[PDB]
RNA sequence: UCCAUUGCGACAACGAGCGAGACCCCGGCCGCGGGCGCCGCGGGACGGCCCGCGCGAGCGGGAGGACGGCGGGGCGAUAGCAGGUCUGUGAUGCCCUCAGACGCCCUGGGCCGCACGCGCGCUACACUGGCGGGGCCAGCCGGCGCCCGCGAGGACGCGCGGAGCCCCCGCCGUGGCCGGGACCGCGGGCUGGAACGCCCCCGCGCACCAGGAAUGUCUUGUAGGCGCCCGCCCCCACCGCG
């Protein structure tokens, strides 16, 4: 705070993970524009990285920008727990990771394939587009 | 006494005093927790622990001879759960943090037990009141 | 007097006299206390609301929409803010401004259905003072409400602006516009 | 939590017994489910509500509402005496009004000269009448046709 | 001797409970004292549909059962094992008014 | 639709906003937002600076709204 | 200062016994039809139970040498699980049978089951009541009284109350069901005694000279 | 649910009634639907209005 | 004239009765008594006073008073409907089923399935606001300590006990945005013989900018807004009684 004037290095629009970010928003709500990052996971990531959180994202010097990347590929080392992650107990390697953009779409596609060849109830339903949980159809939910 | 001064200034002044004087310290799990299932995001200040500590000690002083359990305190820090397309309902706060606070206080003899719960000890009354009078001016 | 009930402990209520005679007796100004709050059960008789202090009458009209029903402390605060703003701009006592507005706002003629004949057959008529003050208050509040919705500016500034413009007789306001509308659709039917 | 009619309140056993006997006057206020008990004695002008002064009651905006009778009658009498109120029952505002009613009624009882008591009554009631006479209206019951005392369930003809 | 005895009486109608009270107070003035405690009224509430089938306007019954309770524990040491009997048989034998004695 | 910045791009602060405000008798966060087309937060910060300097003073304060008076005339 | 989990025993030890009374009402009504059964009452004396009966002719229920009564006592005890000989009974006799609705309606049921026409039975009942000193009696007989298309024809004599709280004091009502070849014949009775007991009917003023 | 101690004391017998389950029922008419368990009653709502006056429940207010 | 076939005053009618009122429960003011716990018995208000009218019954205004002119509920006339209920019952007439049973008991499935039309409700469309921290008061009535766990929950051990809105300080700054929270993908627990049921955590982040022809409810502690208890219940309330 007490940042009135644009710093000499202010960067009007940030690009990261193929997504673009604006420099008028506060930092922890701009990262929410990434797919895989929310409010809770962001406050935790930055804090570990010794970054201010009530700062406009345009004053984010690249030195603080890189250390942030280093913490989103190896987060478990950096002290973050495992109940705070997107993917706990993967179906194959049994480990735990956090999956960002691009990874999510590929990952979501392969499960359905797993569901399809295995011949479950959910897989057959997904392919005619019905409710998967037990939430009732018939009433409401009509054009 | 303490009730002859508004609660707002006492709490924060005493929290600063406590943090300076090494009486209590924020453990490690504070870096990523809410204060209740009713909440939704984490606190914005970095010194919320000592605020809670001061509010608690003030609560214990007010009661006096009476005894307060941890959950009973947690019903004074409740809120409302929203975002469920269903009528809102009141929920109780957390208890781990409250427990840590009272344990830390009790290790210093500011707080004493009993048949049930705990209650303030004469030393606690001494320090609370002296600080209050000091800030009275 | 011995205890001058300075409103909000700032501006007095000793030199505030309405100019218009018609509606003077339907505006209470000597009794206001220091707070626009009084749990009195007005509106029990047919003309007892004629004594309610005008500021309280105004606040009770700012918590109308169902989202905001039962919230009077907020309204008291809002009114205080507006009064500070007025004294700042104009330089004079806001209460006078408010009575002047409630006077200049309020129709003096209206149209009703009595001529039958299977059509509107409306007849122009006259309007009683109590209705005039009620309508003036209602229009003030409503105009402020419509401006502050989905706008960045707050409710209090809209309130003050409406009050000042209506007191100046300017037709930029919502209240004056509604007054003129009713007067014309009436005189057309006289 | 508190109930208003409890014996532990009306007698005000909160005060210690040797001090409980210095209080000569007794008084009552009320509004809705709220009830206030005042124990007035002789002193030098001090007032307390639930062990809290009058300047630091909590709604903030109504502090004038509770200080009203002082600035009406004048501070001489109150400066003469000292009071200790306690209230218990529904609502912040209800509590405010009950408290002011108790203030006024108690200071009325302190004077023994009936003539002055009547004069003060006239002086005070004129400004407001609920400062002496309790407000009677109270919450009313609901019925089974709907979810309110007078409102009904919406009816669909076709 | 002294057995800290207590008297509890329960009833659903308020007219005998007050009559039993008076008899007991009359008959226990000597064997010590016997002043009463009037308890909060336990009221049982049952709401029922007035219809066996569920037709027409939804109309409800509102029953209740008020139970009144008084408690003379004033005997205390002032009554012996046999002395409690004396009065308890000298008081009227109203058909319905439950009574239990405990030290 | 409309967008406004949250951070002043250098000389902009003083070449107008400071000048403009100093020639106003009364002011609030929202007015200045709508006047020179900047977000409200920057208004908060600037007015803090100014009350520190001394040109403006508080007449009414509250979390929802505070209003100032120009003490420079 | 007090615990609410303990007095629930006193409160629940009254409710159970009130229910126990109703089962007895039903059982007696299904049993002592011929003894002019009317009502019952109970007294939960700790040592033993006492029950007080109201019957037109107790000697029938008394039984030669008190045999039927004793046969009954041992029976109830097993059901309510009390030690017999602590389950004693007493019987009381009704003297104003015409003021009792139950006796009247039961007598009417008897007379109907003997094929007598309704027109005689009802008015005999009503004469019996008036002789007893009553201000009104109303009788009703609904059902398939004729070939088909059931209808209700009601007989009355005097004046009757129908609304107000006073109807719970001076108005005595009862009903029965009569099973016959055609079907079921509903019957009900109601009697009005304004000068009952010692209570005074309201809106009734007496003046002096 | 043993409403009373009387009503019990703890080939086909292997599977006559092995599906043990609550069987709470009215103590008058034996139906398993709409049974007021409140206050330890166990009376159906229909089987209730009739006997309510005998029990002592009355309709006032 | 009256809310009232409520009354006055007349009349080939005279004299009675039911219904209406009276009555019962609740609340508001005062007194006596008793008192583990505020609960038992009574008084008080009656178109009574003054002024206007009116033959009269009764109408309008002002007082003094806790309350002023049917304060909220219960009961509910004669006559009747081819209204609903044989699936509430050891209430039932006449029919149908009755040893490969429509009896009774076991195992699974279903009553919930979804291109579609509509009835009562719930959540929102934002600044008279959302998020974070703190302070504080209810009533039908009411159970708590200690230790683990982010939490939901759990192990032990004893009898003891109450909230949302609101108020104060800050952040956001008109952007389908930090408004809104449907749908979906990993994971941790509870009930139970048994999850398809219900709770919690990280991520994804649907419609929606105040709603056409049409239509419902409401006069003082009322509408509306805010939450809290019981019922049915192994678990579960957007329902219902309060």
The residue extents of the domains of chain H are: 13-60
DSSP type of residue F14 = I
Number of Cβ within a 10 Å radius of residue G16: 12
Residue E93 CB lies within 7 Å of the nucleic strand I: no
Residues A96 and A125 occupy one common structural domain: yes
Number of Cβ within a 10 Å radius of residue B99: 13
Say which residues have a Cβ less than 8 Å from residue A30's Cβ, sequence separation at least 6: A14, A21, A22, A57
User: How is residue G6 written in tokens?
Assistant: 């303990």
Contacts 24+ apart (CB under 8 A), G93-97: G93/G54, G93/G55, G93/G56, G93/G57, G93/G58, G94/G36, G94/G38, G94/G54, G94/G55, G94/G56, G96/G132, G97/G36, G97/G56, G97/G132
User: How is residue C115 written in tokens?
Assistant: 């001529």
Say which residues have a Cβ less than 8 Å from residue G42's Cβ, sequence separation at least 6: E95, E96, G17, G20, G21, G24, G49, G50, G51, G52
Query: For residue G36, what is the domain's CATH number?
Result: 3.30.300.20
Which CA-bearing residue is nearest the C1' of I187?
Answer: A88
> What Cα–Cα distance (Å) separates residue D1 from each residue in A132, B100, D34?
47, 28, 12
Judged by 3 or more CB pairs under 8 A, whether C touches B is no
For residue C81, give the chain F residue with the closest CA.
F60
DSSP type of residue A109 = H
Strand I contacts (CB < 7 A) among A residues 23-62?
Answer: 24-26, 29, 32, 34-42, 54
Q: Count the domains in chain D.
A: 1
Q: How far is C190 from chain D (nearest CA, A)?
A: 41
Most D CBs within 10 Å: which of C1, C35, C38, C74, as the mutation test of the D interface? C35
> What Cα–Cα distance (Å) separates residue C77 from each residue in A71, A108, C35, C146?
49, 54, 10, 20
**Which nucleotides of chain I does any protein CB come within 7 A of?**
17-29, 33-41, 66-67, 72-80, 82-85, 88-94, 105-107, 112-124, 126-153, 157-175, 177-178, 180-188, 193, 196-198, 200-205, 209-210, 215-228, 230-234, 237-242
Contacts 24+ apart (CB under 8 A), D69-75: D69/D100, D69/D103, D69/D104, D69/D107, D69/D124, D69/D131, D71/C3, D72/C3, D72/D123, D72/D124, D72/D127, D73/D107, D73/D120, D73/D123, D73/D124, D75/D45
Which residue range is the domain that position G23 belongs to? 10-93
Separation of alpha carbons C143 and B106, rounded Å: 60
Say which residues have a Cβ less than 8 Å from residue E73's Cβ, sequence separation at least 6: E4, E5, E6, E7, E37
Which residue range is the domain that position A87 belongs to? 82-141
Q: Is D141 exposed, middle or buried (0-12, 13-18, 19+ CB in 10 A)?
A: exposed
Residue E44 CB lies within 7 Å of the nucleic strand I: no
For residues C146-181, one letter each, b for 16 or more C-beta atoms within 10 angstroms of the residue's C-beta and e for the rest, the string is ebbeeeeebbbbbbbbbbbbbbbeeeebbbbebbee
* Spatial CA neighbour of G100 closest among G42, G56, G59: G56
Residue A139 CB lies within 7 Å of the nucleic strand I: yes
Residues G69 and G20 occupy one common structural domain: yes
Residues G106 and G70 occupy one common structural domain: no
Q: What angle do CA F59, F62, F66 make, to 5 degrees?
A: 45
Q: Which residues of D touch B61 (CB under 8 A)?
A: none
* Spatial CA neighbour of C17 closest among C9, C29, C8, C26: C29
Separation of alpha carbons B74 and B91, rounded Å: 10
Residue F13 CB lies within 7 Å of the nucleic strand I: no
Q: How far is the CA of G129 from the C1' of I15 (A)?
A: 26
Q: Count the domains in chain G.
A: 2
Is F7 within 8 Å of A5 when comparing Cβ atoms? yes
* Spatial CA neighbour of A71 closest among A90, A98, A92, A52: A98
Q: Which residues of D touch C73 (CB under 8 A)?
A: 59, 61
* Spatial CA neighbour of C54 closest among C74, C67, C38: C38
Residues G121 and G42 occupy one common structural domain: no
Question: F8, A5 in Cβ contact below 8 A?
Answer: yes
* Spatial CA neighbour of D6 closest among D38, D30, D35, D39: D35
Say which residues have a Cβ less than 8 Å from residue C149's Cβ, sequence separation at least 6: none
Q: What are phi and psi of C13, to 5 degrees?
A: -135, 55
Contacts 24+ apart (CB under 8 A), A102-111: A102/A18, A103/A36, A104/A35, A104/A36
* Spatial CA neighbour of B2 closest among B95, B113, B136, B137: B136
Instruction: Concatenate the DSSP letters of all residues of chain C into one string.
Output: --S---BTTTB-SSS---S-STTGGG-B-S---SSS------SSSSSGGGGSBHHHHHHTTSS-SGGGTT--HHHHHHHHHHHHHHHHHT-S-HHHHHHHHHHHSS-S-EEEE---TTS--EEEE---HHHHHHHHHHHHHHHHHHHHTTSSS-HHHHHHHHHHHHHTT-TTSHHHHHHHHHHHHHHTT-
Residues G81 and G135 occupy one common structural domain: no
Separation of alpha carbons G65 and G84, rounded Å: 18
Of G49, G75, G93, which closes a domain?
G93
Say which residues have a Cβ less than 8 Å from residue G31's Cβ, sequence separation at least 6: G37
Separation of alpha carbons D40 and C21, rounded Å: 49
Separation of alpha carbons H43 and H61, rounded Å: 23
Question: Do the strands G87-93 and G49-55 form a parallel or antiparallel pair, or are they unpaired?
Answer: parallel
For residue F11, give the chain A residue with the closest CA.
A5
A1 domain-assigned:
no
- CB of D157 within 8 Å of a chain E CB? The answer is no
Say which residues have a Cβ less than 8 Å from residue G7's Cβ, sequence separation at least 6: E69
Residues A98 and A60 occupy one common structural domain: no
Q: What is the resolution of this structure in A?
A: 2.9
Residue G193, helix vs strand vs coil = coil
Q: Which residues of H touch G81 (CB under 8 A)?
A: 4-6
Q: Count the domains in chain E.
A: 1
Chains adjacent to H (≥3 CB pairs closer than 8 angstroms) = E, G
* Spatial CA neighbour of D28 closest among D7, D10, D48, D50: D10
> What Cα–Cα distance (Å) separates residue C96 from each residue in C30, C138, D118?
13, 18, 37
Residues A71 and A87 occupy one common structural domain: no
G79 domain-assigned:
yes
Question: C168, C101 in Cβ contact below 8 A?
Answer: no
* Spatial CA neighbour of E99 closest among E20, E39, E15: E20
Chains adjacent to E (≥3 CB pairs closer than 8 angstroms) = D, G, H
Separation of alpha carbons B7 and B2, rounded Å: 8
Of G93, G124, G143, which closes a domain?
G93
Is F10 within 8 Å of A1 when comparing Cβ atoms? no
The nucleotide whose C1' lies nearest the CA of F65 is I127
Handedness of CA C141, C142, C145, C146 (dihedral sign): negative
Q: How far is B10 from chain D (nearest CA, A)?
A: 14
Size of interface B-D (CB pairs under 8 A): 6
User: Which residue from E67, E93, E95 is facing G14, i.e. has the nearest CB?
Assistant: E67
Q: What angle do CA H43, H44, H45 make, to 5 degrees?
A: 115
Q: What are phi and psi of C93, to 5 degrees?
A: -75, 125
Is C153 within 8 Å of F34 when comparing Cβ atoms? yes
* Spatial CA neighbour of C168 closest among C110, C109, C92: C92
Q: How far is D33 from chain E (nearest CA, A)?
A: 18
- CB of F41 within 8 Å of a chain C CB? The answer is no
For residue F70, give the chain C residue with the closest CA.
C88
Q: Count the domains in chain A.
A: 2
Say which residues have a Cβ less than 8 Å from residue B121's Cβ, sequence separation at least 6: B109, B110, B111, B112
User: How is residue G150 written in tokens?
Assistant: 């059931």
Residue G18 CB lies within 7 Å of the nucleic strand I: no
- CB of B71 within 8 Å of a chain A CB? The answer is no
G18 domain-assigned:
yes
Question: D50, D88 in Cβ contact below 8 A?
Answer: no
User: How is residue G103 written in tokens?
Assistant: 């006796």
Question: E6, E103 in Cβ contact below 8 A?
Answer: yes
Question: E85, G1 in Cβ contact below 8 A?
Answer: no
User: How is residue A100 written in tokens?
Assistant: 């960002």
Q: Which residues of E touch G10 (CB under 8 A)?
A: 8, 10, 69, 98, 100
Residues A52 and A89 occupy one common structural domain: no
Strands of D27-31's sheet, edge to edge? Answer: D27-31, D34-42, D81-88
Most H CBs within 10 Å: which of E50, E55, E64, as the mutation test of the H interface? E64
Residue B126 CB lies within 7 Å of the nucleic strand I: no
Q: Which of residues 100-129 of D touch C (CB under 8 A)?
A: 128
For residues G40-76, one letter each, b for 16 or more C-beta atoms within 10 angstroms of the residue's C-beta and e for the rest, the string is bbbbbeeeebbbebbbbebeebeeeeeebbeebbeeb
H34 beta partners:
none
Instruction: Please give the span between the terminal C-alpha atoms of chain F, in angstroms, as a whole number.
Output: 37
The nucleotide whose C1' lies nearest the CA of A36 is I203
Separation of alpha carbons C161 and C85, rounded Å: 9
Residue C10 CB lies within 7 Å of the nucleic strand I: no
User: How is residue D1 written in tokens?
Assistant: 């939590």
Separation of alpha carbons G166 and G17, rounded Å: 28
G161 domain-assigned:
yes
Residues A70 and A100 occupy one common structural domain: no
Question: E42, E67 in Cβ contact below 8 A?
Answer: yes
Separation of alpha carbons G173 and G154, rounded Å: 15
Question: C90, C97 in Cβ contact below 8 A?
Answer: yes
A99 domain-assigned:
yes
Residue with tokens 């409160």, as numbered in its chain: G11
Q: How far is the CA of G140 from the C1' of I81 (A)?
A: 20
Strands of G184-192's sheet, edge to edge? Answer: G151-156, G137-143, G184-192, G171-179
Is F34 within 8 Å of C157 when comparing Cβ atoms? no
Separation of alpha carbons D27 and G40, rounded Å: 54
Q: Is G166 exposed, middle or buried (0-12, 13-18, 19+ CB in 10 A)?
A: middle
* Spatial CA neighbour of B79 closest among B59, B93, B98: B93
Separation of alpha carbons A95 and A88, rounded Å: 7
Separation of alpha carbons B32 and B36, rounded Å: 12
Q: Is C128 exposed, middle or buried (0-12, 13-18, 19+ CB in 10 A)?
A: exposed
Query: For residue G129, what is the domain's CATH number?
Result: 3.30.1140.32
* Spatial CA neighbour of G170 closest among G183, G160, G180: G160
Is E46 within 8 Å of H38 when comparing Cβ atoms? yes
> Which residue intervals of E32-101 are DSSP H helices?
81-90
Q: Which residues of E touch H48 (CB under 8 A)?
A: 46, 48
For residue C72, give the chain D residue with the closest CA.
D61
Q: What are phi and psi of E52, to 5 degrees?
A: -80, -10
Residues A13 and A66 occupy one common structural domain: yes
User: How is residue G187 written in tokens?
Assistant: 């019957």
* Spatial CA neighbour of G174 closest among G97, G101, G98: G101
Residue D41, helix vs strand vs coil = strand
* Spatial CA neighbour of C174 closest among C190, C185, C188, C163: C163
* Spatial CA neighbour of H2 closest among H30, H32, H23, H33: H23
Question: D37, D102 in Cβ contact below 8 A?
Answer: yes
G201 domain-assigned:
no
Is B32 within 8 Å of A80 when comparing Cβ atoms? yes
Of A81, A110, A125, which closes a domain?
A81
Residues A43 and A103 occupy one common structural domain: no
Residue C150 CB lies within 7 Å of the nucleic strand I: yes
For residue A68, the surrounding DSSP H or E stretch is: helix A62-73
């Amino acid at each position: 705070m007490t940042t009135i004037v644009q710093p000499n290095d202010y960067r009007d629009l940030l690009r990261m993970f193929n997504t673009n970010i604006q420099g008028k928003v506060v930092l922890e709500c701009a990262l929410v524009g990434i797919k895989g990052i929310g409010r809770r996971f962001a406050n935790v990531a930055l804090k570990k990285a010794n970054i201010d959180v009530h700062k406009r994202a345009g004053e984010l010097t690249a030195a603080e920008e890189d250390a942030l990347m280093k913490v989103l590929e190896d987060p478990l080392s950096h002290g973050i727990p495992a109940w705070m992650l997107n993917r706990n107990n993967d179906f194959e390697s049994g480990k735990d990771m956090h999956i960002l953009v691009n990874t999510i779409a590929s990952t979501h596609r392969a499960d359905l394939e797993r569901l399809r060849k295995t011949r479950c109830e959910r897989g057959v339903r997904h392919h005619h587009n019905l409710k998967v949980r037990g939430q009732h159809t018939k009433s409401t939910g009509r054009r | 006494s303490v009730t002859r001064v508004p609660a707002d200034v006492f709490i924060n002044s005493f929290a600063a005093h406590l943090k300076n004087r090494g009486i209590i310290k924020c453990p490690a799990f504070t870096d990523y927790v809410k204060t209740g299932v009713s909440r939704q995001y984490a606190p914005r200040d970095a010194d919320w622990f000592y605020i809670k500590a001061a509010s608690v000690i003030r609560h214990f002083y007010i009661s006096g001879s009476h005894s307060i359990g941890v959950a009973g305190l947690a019903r004074k820090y409740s809120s409302l759960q929203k975002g469920k397309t269903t009528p809102h309902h009141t929920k109780r706060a957390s208890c781990k943090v409250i427990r840590s606070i009272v344990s830390q206080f009790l290790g210093q003899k500011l707080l004493i037990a009993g048949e049930r719960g705990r209650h303030i000890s004469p030393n606690g009354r001494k320090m609370v009141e002296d600080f209050a009078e000091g800030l009275q001016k | 007097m011995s205890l001058e009930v300075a409103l909000f402990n700032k501006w007095p209520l000793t030199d505030v006299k309405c100019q218009d005679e018609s509606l003077e007796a339907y505006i209470s100004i000597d009794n206001h206390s220091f707070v626009p709050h009084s749990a009195g059960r007005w509106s029990a008789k047919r003309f007892r609301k004629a004594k309610c202090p005008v500021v309280e009458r105004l606040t009770n009209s700012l918590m109308m929409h169902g989202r905001n029903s039962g919230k009077k402390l907020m309204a008291m605060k809002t009114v205080g803010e507006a009064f500070e703003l007025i004294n700042l701009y104009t330089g004079k006592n806001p209460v006078q401004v408010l009575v002047d507005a409630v006077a200049n706002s309020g129709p003096r003629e209206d149209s009703c259905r009595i001529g039958k004949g299977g059509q509107v057959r409306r007849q122009s008529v006259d309007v009683s003072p109590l209705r005039r003050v009620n309508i003036g208050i209602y229009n003030i509040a409503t105009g402020a409400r419509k401006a502050a919705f989905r706008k960045v500016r707050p409710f209090a500034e809209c309130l003050a602006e409406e009050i000042m413009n209506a007191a100046a007789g300017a037709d930029k306001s919502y209240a004056i516009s509604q007054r003129n509308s009713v007067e014309r659709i009436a005189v057309s039917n006289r | 939590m508190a109930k208003g009619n409890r014996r532990d309140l009306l007698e005000r056993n909160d005060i210690e017994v040797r001090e409980r006997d210095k209080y000569t006057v007794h008084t009552l206020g009320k509004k809705k489910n709220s009830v206030a008990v005042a124990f007035v004695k002789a002193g030098k002008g001090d007032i307390l509500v639930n062990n809290v002064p009058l300047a630091l009651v909590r709604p903030e905006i109504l502090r004038t509402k509770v200080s009203e009778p002082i600035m009406i009658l004048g501070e001489s009498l109150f400066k003469g005496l000292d009071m200790n109120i306690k209230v218990a029952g529904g609502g912040h505002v209800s509590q405010i009004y009950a408290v002011r009613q108790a203030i006024s009624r108690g200071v009325l009882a302190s004077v023994k000269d009936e003539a002055a008591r009547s004069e003060l009554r006239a002086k005070l009631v004129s400004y407001d009448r609920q400062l002496v006479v309790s407000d009677p209206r109270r919450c009313e019951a609901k019925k089974f046709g709907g979810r309110g005392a007078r409102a009904r369930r919406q009816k669909s003809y076709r | 001797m002294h057995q800290k005895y207590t008297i509890i009486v329960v009833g659903k109608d308020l007219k005998l409970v007050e009559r039993y009270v008076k008899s007991i107070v009359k008959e226990g003035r000597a064997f010590g004292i016997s002043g009463p405690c009037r308890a909060p009224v336990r009221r049982l509430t049952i709401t029922t549909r007035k219809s066996p089938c569920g037709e027409g306007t939804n109309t409800w019954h509102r029953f209740e059962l008020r139970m009144y309770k008084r408690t003379f524990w004033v005997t205390c040491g002032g009554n012996d094992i046999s002395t409690i009997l004396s009065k308890t048989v000298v008081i009227p034998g109203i058909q319905v008014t439950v009574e239990v004695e405990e030290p | 639709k409309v967008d406004y910045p949250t951070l002043f791009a250098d000389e902009a602060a003083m070449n107008e906003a400071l000048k403009f405000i100093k020639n106003s008798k009364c002011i609030t966060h929202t007015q200045i937002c709508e006047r020179l087309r900047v977000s409200v937060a920057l208004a908060k910060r600037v007015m803090r600076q100014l009350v520190k300097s001394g040109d403006f003073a508080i007449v009414s304060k509250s979390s929802r709204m505070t209003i100032f008076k120009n003490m420079t005339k | 200062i007090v615990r609410r989990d303990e007095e629930n025993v006193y409160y629940s030890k009254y409710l159970n016994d009130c229910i126990m009374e109703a089962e007895l009402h039903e059982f007696f009504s299904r049993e002592l039809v011929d003894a002019g059964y009317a009502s019952c009452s109970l007294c939960r004396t700790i040592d033993s139970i006492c029950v007080i009966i109201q019957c037109a002719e107790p000697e029938v229920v008394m039984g030669d040498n008190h045999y039927r009564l004793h046969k009954i006592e041992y029976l109830l005890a097993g059901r309510f699980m009390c030690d017999p000989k602590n389950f004693n009974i007493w019987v009381d006799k009704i003297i104003k049978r015409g003021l009792s609705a139950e006796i009247m309606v039961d007598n009417l049921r008897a007379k109907l089951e003997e094929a007598m026409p309704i027109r005689r039975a009802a008015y005999s009942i009503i004469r019996t009541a008036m002789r007893a000193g009553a201000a009104g009696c109303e009788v009703i007989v609904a059902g398939k009284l004729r070939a088909q298309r059931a209808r209700a024809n009601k007989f009355k004599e005097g004046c009757l109350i129908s609304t107000g709280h006073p109807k719970r004091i001076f108005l005595a009502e009862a009903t029965r069901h009569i099973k016959m070849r055609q079907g079921v014949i509903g019957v009900k009775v109601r009697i009005y005694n304004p000068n009952i007991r010692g209570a005074v009917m309201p809106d009734k003023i007496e003046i002096g000279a | 649910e043993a409403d009373n101690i009387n009503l019990a004391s703890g080939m086909r017998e292997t599977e006559f009634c092995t599906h043990i389950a609550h069987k709470r029922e009215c103590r008058i008419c034996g139906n398993y639907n709409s049974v007021y368990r409140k206050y330890g009653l166990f009376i159906c709502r229909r089987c209730f209005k009739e006997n309510a006056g005998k029990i002592g429940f009355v309709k006032l207010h």
